[PDB]
Design a protein around this ligand. Sequence first.
Ligand code: HEA
Ligand code: HEA
Ligand SMILES: [Cu+2]
Ligand SMILES: [Cu+2]
Ligand SMILES: [Cu+2]
Ligand SMILES: [Mg+2]
Ligand code: NA
Ligand SMILES: [Zn+2]
Lengths: 98, 56, 514, 84, 84, 43, 227, 261, 75, 47
Amino acid sequence: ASGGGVPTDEEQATGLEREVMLAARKGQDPYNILAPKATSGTKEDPNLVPSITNKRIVGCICEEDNSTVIWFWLHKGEAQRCPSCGTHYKLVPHQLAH
Amino acid sequence: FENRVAEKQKLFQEDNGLPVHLKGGATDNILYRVTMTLCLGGTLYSLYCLGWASFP
Amino acid sequence: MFINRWLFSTNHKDIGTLYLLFGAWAGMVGTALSLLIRAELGQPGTLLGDDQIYNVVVTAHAFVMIFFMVMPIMIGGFGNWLVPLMIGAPDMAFPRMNNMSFWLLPPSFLLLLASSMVEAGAGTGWTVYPPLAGNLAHAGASVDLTIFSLHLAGVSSILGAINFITTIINMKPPAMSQYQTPLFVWSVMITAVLLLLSLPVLAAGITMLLTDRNLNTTFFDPAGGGDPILYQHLFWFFGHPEVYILILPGFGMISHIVTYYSGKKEPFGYMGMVWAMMSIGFLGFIVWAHHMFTVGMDVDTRAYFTSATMIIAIPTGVKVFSWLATLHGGNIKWSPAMMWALGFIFLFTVGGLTGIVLANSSLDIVLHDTYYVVAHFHYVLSMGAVFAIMGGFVHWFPLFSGYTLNDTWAKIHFAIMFVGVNMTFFPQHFLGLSGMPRRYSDYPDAYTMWNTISSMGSFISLTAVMLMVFIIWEAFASKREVLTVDLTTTNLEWLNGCPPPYHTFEEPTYVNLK
Amino acid sequence: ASAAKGDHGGTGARTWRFLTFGLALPSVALCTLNSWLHSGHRERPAFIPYHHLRIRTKPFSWGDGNHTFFHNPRVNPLPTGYEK
Amino acid sequence: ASAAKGDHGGTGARTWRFLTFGLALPSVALCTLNSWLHSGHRERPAFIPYHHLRIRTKPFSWGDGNHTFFHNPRVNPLPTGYEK
Amino acid sequence: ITAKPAKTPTSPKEQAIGLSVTFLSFLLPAGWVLYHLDNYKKS
Amino acid sequence: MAYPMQLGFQDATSPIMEELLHFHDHTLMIVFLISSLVLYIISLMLTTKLTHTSTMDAQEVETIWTILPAIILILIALPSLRILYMMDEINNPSLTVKTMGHQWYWSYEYTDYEDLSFDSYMIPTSELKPGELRLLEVDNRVVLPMEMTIRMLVSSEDVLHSWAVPSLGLKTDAIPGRLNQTTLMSSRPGLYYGQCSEICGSNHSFMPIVLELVPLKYFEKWSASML
Amino acid sequence: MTHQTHAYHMVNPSPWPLTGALSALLMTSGLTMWFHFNSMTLLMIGLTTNMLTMYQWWRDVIRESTFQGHHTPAVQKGLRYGMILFIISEVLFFTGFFWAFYHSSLAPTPELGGCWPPTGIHPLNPLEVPLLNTSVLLASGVSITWAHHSLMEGDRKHMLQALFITITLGVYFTLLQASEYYEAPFTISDGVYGSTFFVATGFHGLHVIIGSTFLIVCFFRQLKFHFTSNHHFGFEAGAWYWHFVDVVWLFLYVSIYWWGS
Amino acid sequence: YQTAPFDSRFPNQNQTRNCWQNYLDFHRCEKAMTAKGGDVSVCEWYRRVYKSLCPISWVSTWDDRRAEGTFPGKI
Amino acid sequence: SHYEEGPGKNIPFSVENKWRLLAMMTLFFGSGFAAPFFIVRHQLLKK
Ligand code: HEA
Ligand code: HEA
Ligand SMILES: [Cu+2]
Ligand SMILES: [Cu+2]
Ligand SMILES: [Cu+2]
Ligand SMILES: [Mg+2]
Ligand code: NA
Ligand SMILES: [Zn+2]
């Protein structure tokens, strides 16, 4: 065999595909493709919910194997808490906007 | 061969406020108006045939 | 602008709405046909003049209600509207394709209407079995038109079944497992799988009938060495998964409705409720032949089919008892939809129990093709699938529109249709045990009372469906905009307000990986 | 027949524990019931001295060398006829 | 028969280009030779008016409506007998 | 479910009208066809 | 036949039909049990101000409502399967009459010895004689010997039909190119009516079945007089 | 909101679903006109608007993927499921035809002569051209595989070379099958043997023509540099569908050509 | 002889073959005894049975087919 | 996207005048319910 010729993504991927491509290699995830990892959720260690606005819906799986997710709008301001388990969440400005 | 995919990329990413099926050019519109015309005419023709057929 | 929105859509909501409109209209057509059917039977003798018109009428009733009312509404309507909302998706996986699934329905309905216009129409029963369905006994374009109406209706569903499975599976919040999605979603994912597997077999079966009618094949013609019974296998192989495709989404809506109005955060035994639907879906593929107990099969196989058909009651049973467990200790809100939910729970019970009787091939010998089976299936379809459609509609109307319905008018409507449907179908159990056959436009004098009462009943329901149209009108006429919705923590479809904006979830929800 | 049970017949220890107790084991229970229901013990078949059966070209290396390993006297006739 | 060709019937564009020209294509050449060797044109079968053949319950939507789509006059008799 | 009061309330009289128009639109066209069935059956 | 304002099955004219009445009573008793239970539990659930909206433990009670329904199904399936094998049971018929559905009339054939065969049509209600049943009377009844195991063989010469006769507890579709067998055996003389139980076109509703059962002797003379 | 932060594609309103729905109305009712009023103008219009719709719809799909970069990872994983599911629905379509066949052959009616193949039928020799068609299809299965690996290794020329060989084998099978149809001593009208044979093998034949125009498309997109060594779903779908096509042929071959004859 | 007795080899509701088998069996026996003479003895049992079970029209169309030499069964 | 939003704006028919709606809903459902009836009249008027 032998030879070359086909473009690479690194060199041909455009649009949002390219955007999630690079962002991904910088380690960041601006397009919510992966699942946020929890923090202790204490009042001094709230889960920081990034947002491109001033309120974002939060789903809290209180206990590990729970089948019911508790949903609520988290707003810009003082850390709020899941109505069923306390657990603090604090909004944060969303970074990579392109 | 060529490999002018970037020329196309720019053309289709151009912010001309057009929907993708028109984004490509003038021929897109003629093709579009042709398809819509045959579908509409055809749908009318078929309706005429059903009427013609729904009587002994 | 109207075109771009309503004809060139790519919005799960605008499409779901388009379905409910088609569904409601087809619902009006099927109701009319169900009334011609009973007008003809409400008095000894013949009303319609000729029997072929009656059969054409009975056949169309079944197709319109099944393929153009129940299915569009439950899957295309509630399915597109609520699925993306309940799992937090921006839209369906294939927005453009989804639009085709809808637009295939109006042409499909045109073909079915056309068939009853040309020639003498298709008086074949909704099972369209040959030879009656062939080119001798039904020479002409009618059956062929009926066969094409189903080809289109089947492509539309197979297409959307692909959309819901990909959506429900590939577009959930990354931290959310399938054992975290709401039961309605599970109900439509499973229903979608049944469509993906059964609908292609019907499409093959009716293609074979079409070639037998126009291309000189003899798949079902003994002359060529064919077999009219082979068609019965292909059709019923699709035909049973179909009866379940019609009840599953209703199972889901009812689970949401009963939990919401008991003030519970979740339905009892969630995972058992998931096991139950999955079981019903699986068993529903190995029982088809109960639809053929008087056709000539080997007793041993007739024995297998009644046994297999019975095990289905077990899983179904855990759902009936789970819903009861969900009301247990609930703070019950006697709202219109809770009434529709309570009716379904009992009426569907009676009707499925009545179907356990028929599972018995020995006894089916004498119950088959009589009005006892017409009773069985109208309890589950007319008082099960329909009751779920009404409960779900009155429950989610404010979300779709942003306006509220008059709760008192809504309850009168329930009260009327409850009497109506029961008075129409109850007597029919008698008529069948006593021998009155199905597909008859007339009957021996003895059967006069029950058919007389039954038809009267059919007139009460009509009243209930006229009042309903009014109820929707006055809802839109008064303009009572929604202010506060209860229990939204656990009910995500209500979080973006009534009605949700054109684009919900442009920014995903946030769900932690504990 | 065929098969199609909604979804989830793949990936996740939970999913596999689900199928184990929700499909797999319930099946074994049914089949076990069926097997225990048609446990109708057959009558020992009539004995006819057919030449292509009860073959014996060399005595078995155990017992009287005329008795097969899992010899069940009730259904297995010796070359000459049933045990008793 | 069976099969087992030493190794390498997996992974590598080179390996697959190897199988393409070293197994795949040579096979098609053999089978093509075999097919061209037994290209013995059968004699048109005797025509007997059997009732389960040459079926015709509705004329075909083309031609004289008595001629099948890929009608080959030399081996396909009409209902009444061979074309000529 | 709480809601703002009606933007354009529908007084009883208005409802009576709408309930009447709705009913007739269902009953008249069918009544006509059914009332004449015998004529059709007479050719 | 059926009488005005009937609720259940027509009276059993043969032994399997009696057998089915009892099974159906058994089965019906059970559906009455279950459906009244599900209605009691519902009103129970809806009749208290007491609340317990917190999470409840499932499964524990889930075994009861899963094993119990399974025991019941066995209690129906057994009796049911018995009667089924009993229906497809080895009997030895002393006669073999054939019947063939036709688009809007049945024709019977008794060809065991002679070659007897006749059509059978519904009597236009216009021409019924006082006392005759409106859509049930046929011109030529199918005469058969009472108290005897007959073997019926149903088929059709066109579309599908279904030969049925409730009182005896028989129903066998009529399928072209097929010969379906069924065993008839009345234990009482009389007239027994039935109707086509498979949509077959315009007059699916107008092609009944009437069985006239008389003692052998009258059967033989009838048969001969019939040709 | 306004700007999206999910990796999903929100497709612009497209007039294609309508134009394709209307397309099916024209084709079906057009087939009814042909079958009964022996006219083809309606069916011809339907087939035309149909090709026009499939052309532009897939055209846009390329526009959005290749040119506008909308097919992120999240999006492709969904296109994967869709194709798998679509293929499955097609397996069940061919399943009714093998059902039809076995129902017919495992129990031949006396009208056939109470046997299989029925008296009067002279089946083809499975060792003749049916074997040739089997080897042609199987070969294309290995050549299409070589093409996929070349693609992943960025070998532009060899991918074009393997795809070309593959395409010509599908055309070869199509021509061979066409001649077999013409030379066969039986027809669709020769009872259930002809019925069962020509519609099962017929539909598969139509599937080879649809699988070959799919690969022809993949061929040109490649000439035009659309695929990268890593994002090339259209070719994977093209290859999945092509393998579905051999498998159906092996089942046809062993069942109808070998066993059933 | 009253009517065809039970035949273990056709024990199910579908008897189409029972008719068919006996109609072949008969005509084949008949043809043999003819092309053998054998004091022109005859195989009546099959004709009695197939006569009982087969619908007349089957028997007629079959005989016709045998006449024109288009009977698909082998005798 | 210039698509209006909110109550009464997410549907394909105007809901501004309750009487014009009364008339649209009437032609809509009304025509559906009448279709079967006139299809029968049609079959009864053919030969
Ligand atoms: C879901 C399916 C469905 C539904 C609901 C119904 C509803 C009705 N059907 Fe049935 N029917 C069938 C499916 C259905 N039917 C089938 C499959 C057959 C067999 C055909 C055959 O034998 O071939 C049949 C046969 C059949 C017969 C037997 C004829 C014969 O065999 O001789 C009869 C007669 O009484 C009958 C009666 C009725 C009546 C009185 C209604 C009434 O209950 C109608 C009451 C009104 C409704 C319950 C619908 C109103 C709901 C809506 C319109 C939705 C509104 C929209 C929104 C809220 C968004 N039907
Ligand atoms: C909504 C769809 C629907 C549903 C859900 C069902 C569900 C069932 N149906 Fe139904 N059926 C129809 C619609 C439906 N059917 C239709 C349309 C036909 C007619 C088709 C035609 O020919 O036109 C038909 C025909 C039909 C026949 C054939 C009649 C004949 O032609 O001879 C059979 C026979 O077995 C049958 C059985 C059943 C059974 C076992 C159930 C079971 O799924 C029901 C299960 C429910 C329960 C049993 C109740 C809940 C459980 C408990 C409370 C636990 C305790 C129970 C016990 C101990 C038994 N149905
Ligand atoms: Cu079923
Ligand atoms: Cu009939
Ligand atoms: Cu009939
Ligand atoms: Mg039937
Ligand atoms: Na009547
Ligand atoms: Zn929480």
